[PDB]
C-alpha cells in the first residue's frame with residue numbers, strides 16, 4: 383500500500399494511536415488525529431506538527447479523509463464512522479496497517495480468556511528456538527511498534543475490536559481460544575455479533591486452531607483442535623497426573639510446567655498447536671512450557687503469609703475469566719472474593735453456581751457492585767471502592783482463607799486499567815496481610 387498524498391485521519395490516541403501517527407510520519411504522510419476524550423492518553427507526546435481535535439469527533443475531518451484509521455476503542459457503529467463508511471471512505475485499524483507491511487509470518491490469537499497467556503507462551507516457544515520474534519498487539523507493544531525487517535515471526539494478541547477493522551491478515555496459524563459473553567456494550571446484536579468479529583481471524587489463515595470444547599470457536603462452515611478429553615491436542619489423565627498429548631502421543635507431563643490448572647493446560651495445548659503450525663521445533667516449544675511462570679495479574683499470588691493467600695486475578699475482566707478462577711478452586715477456609723467494576727452489561731448469573739456453601743464471602747464494589755452482591759445477598763457486602771472492600775474484609779480473614787480479586791468486570795470506571803487495579807490490590811494486600 384502507498385499512503386503518499388493521502389488525507390489520513392487517526393481516531394483515538396494512546397500508545398496505539400501514537401504508533402499509527404509515527405507510522406504515517408515515517409512514510410512522509412502527516413495524519414490528523416481526533417479522540418472523543420478531552421485529554422486522551424499520549425496527547426503530550428503528539429508532535430506539534432500533527433493537527434488534533436479532542437473531546438469529540440470532527441465530521442469535517444472525517445468526511446474529508448481518504449483513509450480513516452480507527453482505534454479499537456471507537457465503535458465502527460458510531461454515527462460519524464458509519465456516515466464515513468456509507469460514503470465509501472476506507473476504514474482500517476493498526477493491525478490492518480501492520481498486516482499490509484509485515485514481512486514475517488504472523489501467529490494470531492484471540493478469545494474471551496487465555497489470549498495473553500497463549501500469545502506470551504508462543505512468544506516464549508519462539509525465543510527458545512532462537513527465533514527473532516515480535517510479540518505484542520493487544521498486549522505489550524502495539525503491533526506497528528514491532529515491525530522490523532529482522533523479525534522472523536510475529537505473535538499477536540488480537541481483540542475482537544481490532545479484528546473488525548482488519549481485512550488483510552493471512553495468519554500462519556490463527557486461533558479463537560473460546561467465546562464467552564463479553565463486550566456486550568459494544569455488540570448490540572449480542573453474542574453472535576461478538577463471535578462474528580472473532581471469526582474474522584480465520585479468514586485466509588493457513589492453519590486454524592479451534593477449541594474442541596467450545597463450538598463457538600469453530601468457523602461457520604478442517605481446523606486443528608485442542609481440548610480436554612478430545613481434540614488433536616488434548617489431555618490424558620493418569621491417576622493424579624496429567625499429560626499433554628498430540629494425537630495419542632504423550633508430549634509433556636504437566637508436573638514439568640510452572641503453570642497449574644486445567645485451563646492453563648489447555649492454553650498450553652493451544653500454544654503448542656500454534657507453534658507446531660508456525661513451524662517451531664516441538665522440542666524447544668515444550669521446553670518453553672516448562673519455564674513460563676505466568677503473567678502479572680493473572681491468578682497471581684501477591685502474598686502468601688500467616689496462612690492466607692492473597693491472589694491478584696485483576697485480569698479477570700469478564701464472567702468467563704472469573705469462572706475459570708473459581709471452577710475447581712480449592713480453599714481450606716473461607717474464600718473472600720472481590721467482584722466489581724463495569725460489567726459491560728454481562729449476565730453475572732453463571733457465577734452463582736460457584737458461590738454456595740458456608741465458606742464464601744463476597745465483597746462487591748464499583749459501578750455494578752449492587753448487581754454483583756445480588757448473586758448471593760446473604761454473604762455479600764457492597765462498598766464504593768476496592769480499597770473499602772479490602773479494608774472491610776481484612777479483619778475477617780483467618781488462617782486457611784484465600785482473598786481473591788477476580789472481579790469479572792472492567793476496571794475503567796475507577797481505574798486507569800486492570801494493571802492499576804491489580805497493583806493497588808497488591809499494595810493493600812501487603813499492608814493488610816501482615817502485622
Ligand SMILES: O=C(O)CC[C@@H](NC(=O)c1cc(CNc2ccc(/C=C3\SC(=S)NC3=O)cc2)ccc1F)C(=O)O
Nearest residue numbers: 393394417418419454455456541699792793794799800
Ligand atoms: O483494563 C480493564 O479493566 C479493562 C479492559 C478492557 N478493555 C477493553 O474493552 C479493550 C480496550 C482496548 C484498549 N484500547 C483503547 C483505545 C482507546 C480507548 C478509548 C477511546 S478511543 C476514542 S476516539 N474515544 C475513546 O474513549 C479505549 C481502549 C482495546 C481492546 C479492548 F477490548 C475490557 O476488556 O473490559
Ligand SMILES: [Cl-]
Nearest residue numbers: 418437438439
Ligand atoms: Cl462526537
Ligand SMILES: [Cl-]
Nearest residue numbers: 738739740741
Ligand atoms: Cl464448600
Ligand SMILES: [Cl-]
Nearest residue numbers: 770773774775
Ligand atoms: Cl472497615
